[PDB]
């Protein structure tokens, strides 16, 4: 599981089984009397592709003066499993706060901002590349070794695919241009962390790195759509960003997310 | 996995990851554009054990009118796996209140309402008992076939022993005297509701039934410390509900729940 000297620090803490935006990866949330700590874990099986956890690592050391982030505390190899220790993000869980009704407009700017700021990175010596081409050869990868999602299969509703393997060729063939920025990779309403209105936070980042700029304005919109059904938002956010809506990149994306 | 019928069904919905207080069961948070649904999931490994959900589909219903808890909608056995799909809890999670200074206060008199409305509950024709010799047949059953944790081990900090058996045997020994009432069973500030100051949801409730009163108040005490460094605040909360702290049965309560 965990190297003696891990295993030792971890027990000072209360440790409880994840309860944030997590997913294959095995999460830890260590509670202590005084502050918290996020243990995550993830094997071989997943070495190497999006999943991996030594690839959030390696994002998380590189975006250090750049986005909020947490700080790195612990990183190891241990019987074939990467692990990762982490202190906790600065600040409030933007997830709370949507469930009324005088508040959209303000999480639409979050959105906005948290957007810009990625297209302000410095993409020259970025660790990673999350291009197209990279991430359907990872997805081909867990398709051939059923590392995939049987269970929840949204593609069925969405499209008239039936398996996989489909949908697959489908959006290979569909593959669009792209223009590489920073992307977050899994930009939710739960990974972003906010500070007296303003942007404090970011975490879940094993799929960050190089790709489209439209990958990540795919997520905000769906976002906007579940915590704020008035499709107005949608334009007041493409309006702030300032950029016409490519609708067949958005949907593009959207379909993409559905496999893994 | 699931019935076609409800393969069917939660399609429509988004579907994602455990994302709020889940431990051995898959846990998958269905997102509408409209409201969300909770699909909770435990083989045939668990069965009859307090994991076993369709213990907390029997807890769930019978619950019905007494304490504010999500609405049942569906539950199937498929495949060997207890499948509950229910709606989502009322109002807003506790546990998003705590990370300030003025504040305390208020959350110590709902754990205070929390335990009268249990000790309020008829428990006569209750489901379930979560009796000491219980749950100390149940727990002898997981570590008998490694349904236990081997990661993180609480025990090894707070205890002196090496291996669950010993920690096991010992709590066998010191097993207290029992006087029942409606216990909640897993207790903690992810798993109440508040709205307007009010409790207003409960969730996670597998180890509903009836238990010694300690053992909530156990809980609750581990709170406090946790979210609250102060020990002047479980005077208040033991001066609210008006009882004197059985010390050792706290302490009992709180290395069981270590083992689990």
């Known amino acids: ?39 995550k874990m993830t094997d071989s099986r997943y070495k190497g592709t999006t999943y991996d956890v030594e690839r959030e690592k390696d994002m998380m050391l590189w975006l250090e003066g750049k986005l909020p982030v947490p700080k790195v505390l612990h990183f190891e190899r241990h019987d074939g499993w990467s692990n990762l220790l982490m202190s906790e993000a600065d600040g409030v869980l933007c997830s709370e706060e949507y469930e009324d009704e005088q508040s959209p407009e303000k999480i639409i700017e979050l959105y906005a901002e948290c957007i810009r700021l990625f297209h302000s990175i410095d993409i020259s010596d970025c660790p990673y590349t999350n291009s197209l081409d990279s991430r359907l050869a990872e997805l081909d990868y867990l398709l051939n070794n059923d590392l995939a999602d049987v269970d929840c299969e949204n593609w069925e509703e969405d499209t008239p695919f039936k398996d996989p393997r489909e949908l697959y060729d489908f ?9 590489l920025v920073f992307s977050h990779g ?12 303003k942007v404090s936070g970011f975490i879940d980042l094993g799929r960050s790195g190089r790709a489209d700029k439209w990958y990540d304005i795919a997520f905000c919109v769906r976002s906007i759509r579940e915590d704020i059904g ?11 960003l300032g950029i016409k809506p490519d609708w067949e990149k958005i949907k593009y994306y959207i379909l993409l997310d559905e496999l893994f």
């Open 1 to 39: 599981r965990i190297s003696p000297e891990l295993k030792k620090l971890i027990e000072k803490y209360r440790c409880v089984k994840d309860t944030e935006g997590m997913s294959p990866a095995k999460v830890y949330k260590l509670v202590g009397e005084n502050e918290n700590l996020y243990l």
């Open 171 to 179: 959006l290979k063939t569909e593959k669009p241009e792209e223009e």
């Open 230 to 240: 008035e499709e107005q938002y949608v334009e007041l956010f493409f309006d702030l």
């Open 186 to 197: 899994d930009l939710g309403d739960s990974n972003i962390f906010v500070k007296d209105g």
